[PDB]
Input
Amino acid sequence: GADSGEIILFSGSNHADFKAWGGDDWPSAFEISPKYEPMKLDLNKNFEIKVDYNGADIVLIFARWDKDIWAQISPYYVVDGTAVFTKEQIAKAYGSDDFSGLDYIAVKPLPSEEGVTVTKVSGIYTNG
Output
């Protein structure tokens, strides 16, 4: 499997604060509702997603409401501020590698004092 990228999915500065569950909501530093917004990454291909962030530990979420799936994973690794999540890790947490009907993709901070800032989300095709 030969790689190609990156494909920029977000660039800018989004900050989210979050200190504990139980509350109003659990905000995202980046999120996409794929039935309503173009997803520039083909999830049927093999891929990984990279997130440049500063601050809180983060998780990546893929969710599908009607099947009650909430696949939540930590990065495989983080290096100099860039977290990487593989399609293998997301498929394992989701219970399938078939993301038809996906409703939600989000990068969320776990609890922290400072919150998280996300400055880039990208994809790399790692084959298909």
